[PDB]
């Protein structure tokens, strides 16, 4: 409860698979703390048979304010070489997450698309995904938002 | 405790305009997703609007395109679905619910909206 | 989108399996809840195989393909009800067509 979020804007958008993510983050601390926050950015894939969660990226923000703070969390892209080639021309989602030593508090779900520019690839598909030709597009407008209540004392 | 409470239920003509109020207690609207689903009676679940954080922006069943407007009000802590020419299709319980990522995890008890001659 | 079977009797004990088709096949989309008559529905699993907290551990969920499943693992009492699959879309969330299970005799 102690920090809420105010906005987040996805300053990249739309962009290619390979292309980092920039989010300019705007938030509220509430009665300041020490121990420091933990923003981490989470790739959330689901395929024929599994459903694969891999961290793509984390920062910490030093020191935390009082009041409304504005920082930009670059974060490193996702790895094609790591996924399904499934995962990399459908919907996907990323979970912005911000912690308080070791404790997630808030959790910001994000649909997101990917699929290829050239318009006869889209039509027929190459035998290979072409990552380079694929541009992701995040539904920043519309976050799915948990909170979880964690003892920041 | 979290509760969540509707309010402006009652009896419309067809083509009327009613406003229903969701009252949000224990936590503040502008955080979270906050979504209107309603059931005729003895039949499923229907979504209607949905309001997200942060921007507005907002979803809209087809059926109720451009005459249901979702919104919220962050100082009164409260939300509106207003329906404007509004049918005999639309009598229902209107349920409220604020979002849990892509859930719902608390709900209203509901107000019945009745639309007949 | 589409919920099978819309009726299900069954005795107490029993182990009992719901089953919803959607078109996304992301498990962060998709959610159960569990409403008795004149009450508001109640979440039991969210993001396809999460157990919402405060909900028995009879209760479980998983996505294959494009279906979507809960069981309960041995009926209770307090557990006939009806169901309802949820699907958070990209542009609109969906309810399945519901799901009630009465009590054999």
């Known amino acids: 409860s102690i920090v809420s979020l105010l906005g987040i804007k996805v300053l990249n958008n739309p962009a290619k698979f390979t292309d980092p993510y920039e989010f300019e983050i705007t938030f509220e601390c509430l009665e300041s703390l020490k121990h420091d926050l933990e923003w981490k950015l989470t790739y959330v894939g689901s395929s024929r048979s599994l459903d694969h969660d891999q961290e793509l990226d984390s920062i910490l923000v030093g020191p935390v304010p009082v009041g409304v703070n504005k920082f930009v969390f670059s974060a490193d892209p996702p790895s094609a070489e790591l996924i399904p080639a499934s995962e990399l021309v459908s919907v996907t989602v990323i979970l912005l997450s911000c912690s308080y030593d070791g404790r997630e508090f808030v959790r910001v779900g994000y649909y997101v698309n990917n699929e290829y520019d050239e318009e006869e690839l889209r039509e027929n598909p190459p035998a290979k995904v072409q990552v380079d030709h694929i541009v992701r597009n995040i539904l920043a407008e519309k976050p799915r938002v948990t909170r979880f209540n964690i003892v920041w004392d | 405790e979290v509760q969540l409470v509707e309010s402006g239920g009652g009896l419309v003509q067809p083509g009327g305009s009613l406003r229903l109020s969701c009252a949000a207690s224990g936590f503040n609207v502008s955080y979270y997703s906050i979504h209107w689903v309603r059931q005729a009676p003895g039949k499923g679940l229907e979504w209607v609007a949905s309001i997200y954080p942060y921007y507005g922006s907002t979803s809209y069943a087809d059926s109720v395109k451009g005459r249901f407007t979702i919104s919220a009000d962050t100082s009164k802590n409260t939300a509106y679905l207003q329906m404007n020419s509004l049918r005999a299709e639309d009598t229902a319980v209107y349920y409220c619910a604020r979002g849990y990522g892509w859930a719902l995890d608390y709900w209203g008890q509901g107000t019945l909206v009745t639309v007949s001659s | 989108m589409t919920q099978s079977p819309s009726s299900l009797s069954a005795s107490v004990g029993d182990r009992v399996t719901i089953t919803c088709r959607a078109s996304?096949?992301?498990?962060?989309?998709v959610a159960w809840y569990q409403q008795k008559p004149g009450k508001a529905p109640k979440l039991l699993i969210y993001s396809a195989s999460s157990l919402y907290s405060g909900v028995p551990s009879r209760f479980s969920g998983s996505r294959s393909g494009t279906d979507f499943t809960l069981t309960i693992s041995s009926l209770q009492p307090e557990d006939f009800a009806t169901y309802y699959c949820?699907?958070?879309?990209?542009?609109?969330?969906?309810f399945g067509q519901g799901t009630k299970v009465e009590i054999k005799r």
């Open positions: 949820q699907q958070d879309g990209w542009s609109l969330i969906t």
């Open positions: 996304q096949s992301v498990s962060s989309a």
